[PDB]
Ligand binder design. Structure first.
Ligand SMILES: OC[C@H]1O[C@@](CO)(O[C@H]2O[C@H](CO)[C@@H](O)[C@H](O)[C@H]2O)[C@@H](O)[C@@H]1O
Ligand SMILES: [Cl-]
Length: 404
């Protein structure tokens, strides 16, 4: 009842190219008040960054409901992902309005980047669904998963050298030295390891987790004790799925250290964030063992901050059976329902609209692009799948002045 795919469905478009190749697109932007399709004028109409996450949403919907229409969307979004595979084994990101591929723009080249990791994660997430339903598409997907992993393995830097920024160690072997990108590649590799275990996949998993863990703040005197930094000495909330990824990988490998590191973020940094109304980003300085805040930015706040935290807390509950994590997951979900600095409703169950962000205490961006819609839907979809969390969120919503 909370989850309403009507706006995401309106961003979806099936296009035919070449010889009966049917591609599922998700239009990237959509603007208040008419909420039609809006493009990026330079980059194109739809990106793997969004299509990949949409594929996961619709696959999870199909798993919950068995709806033939959800499955059809999974298949066509997967076709777009496969359509974007480059000869070198990486992926292009954008498609243009004329349905040619954006191969050369910096946000779209087939080089290791965010959209590679998201594409791979989407393919590993939807493969078990495809193998039960569509033999030919499943075979192509499996071939692509492990061919892409081959390429990533061939290019992988296992030499664990460290830089430094404001006293903080930098793992030079992570992609773009980015803990957030590393977490999604780690999630994808963990899924693939369950499909076909390979020593080189475990080796990459452990190397990524080592880099992610080196970037964690471990200073019990620091306000942001437990935080997984995103890049150098910087944390940003968006896409920061390190804790969730370490829980997934730690479970896959039986690695207690990974699990312990993830809980350290959940048990210290998450309650701090929640108590302070969330943040967009911050930077730190490290002097010896002491980690201190340099600067922080409360805005902008976007749906993509909430989803990684809700994913991690639900997973923590599943592992530990501690209800505090469900309570926190629900309290974080309330960001969509006016628990935020603008006291603004950010997701509308009646229409499926998800606002694009909070820019200050008094300014809300009422556009509803693909990313914010998918991230709100994935968050609420997870809550509604856990009966105790669903019951808790419904109880919180009956008491407040939201539109539903
Ligand atoms: O502008 C295109 C596209 O960008 C987004 C990203 O969230 O919004 C940006 O641009 C808006 C005006 O064009 C600004 O008001 C907003 O602050 C900025 O984030 C989408 O909302 C929009 O569709
Ligand atoms: Cl992601």
């Amino acid at each position: 009842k909370l989850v309403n795919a009507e706006h995401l469905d309106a961003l979806y478009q099936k296009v035919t190219v070449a010889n009966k190749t049917e591609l599922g697109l998700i239009h990237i932007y959509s603007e208040f008040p008419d909420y039609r399709w809006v493009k990026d004028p330079i980059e194109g109409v739809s990106a793997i960054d969004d299509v990949a996450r949409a594929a996961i949403f619709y696959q999870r919907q199909y798993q919950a409901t068995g709806s033939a229409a959800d499955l059809e969307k999974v298949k066509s979004l997967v076709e777009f992902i496969l359509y974007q595979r480059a000869d070198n084994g990486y992926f292009y990101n954008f498609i243009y309005p004329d349905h040619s591929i954006n191969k050369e723009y910096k946000t779209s080249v087939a080089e290791p980047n965010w959209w590679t990791w998201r594409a791979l994660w989407a393919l590993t997430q939807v493969y078990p669904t495809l193998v039960k339903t569509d033999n030919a598409l499943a075979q192509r997907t499996r071939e692509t998963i492990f061919a892409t992993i081959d390429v990533i393995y061939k290019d992988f830097n296992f030499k664990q050298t460290r830089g430094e920024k404001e006293g903080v160690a930098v793992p030079e072997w992570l992609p773009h030295t980015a803990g957030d990108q590393a977490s999604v590649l780690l999630m994808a590799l963990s899924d693939a390891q369950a499909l076909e275990a390979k020593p080189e996949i475990e080796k990459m998993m452990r190397s990524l987790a080592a880099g992610i863990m080196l970037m964690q703040v471990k200073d019990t005197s620091s306000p942001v004790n437990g935080a997984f930094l995103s890049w150098q000495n910087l944390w940003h909330g968006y896409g920061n799925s390190q804790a969730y990824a370490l829980l997934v990988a730690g479970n896959r490998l039986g690695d207690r250290d990974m699990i312990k590191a993830a809980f350290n973020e959940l048990d210290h940094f998450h309650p701090w964030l929640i108590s302070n109304g969330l943040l967009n980003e911050f930077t730190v300085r490290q002097q010896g063992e002491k980690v201190t805040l340099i600067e922080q930015k409360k805005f902008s706040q976007i749906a993509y901050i909430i989803r990684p935290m809700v994913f991690a807390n639900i997973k923590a509950w599943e592992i530990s059976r501690d209800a505090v994590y469900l309570e926190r997951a629900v309290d974080l979900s309330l960001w969509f329902f006016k628990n935020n600095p603008a006291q603004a409703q950010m997701y509308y169950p009646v229409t499926g609209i998800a606002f694009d962000g909070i820019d200050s205490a008094t300014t809300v961006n009422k556009n509803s692009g693909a990313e914010s819609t998918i991230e709100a839907l994935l968050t609420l979809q997870l809550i509604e799948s856990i009966p105790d969390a669903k019951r808790m969120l419904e109880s919180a919503l009956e008491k407040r002045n939201i539109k539903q």
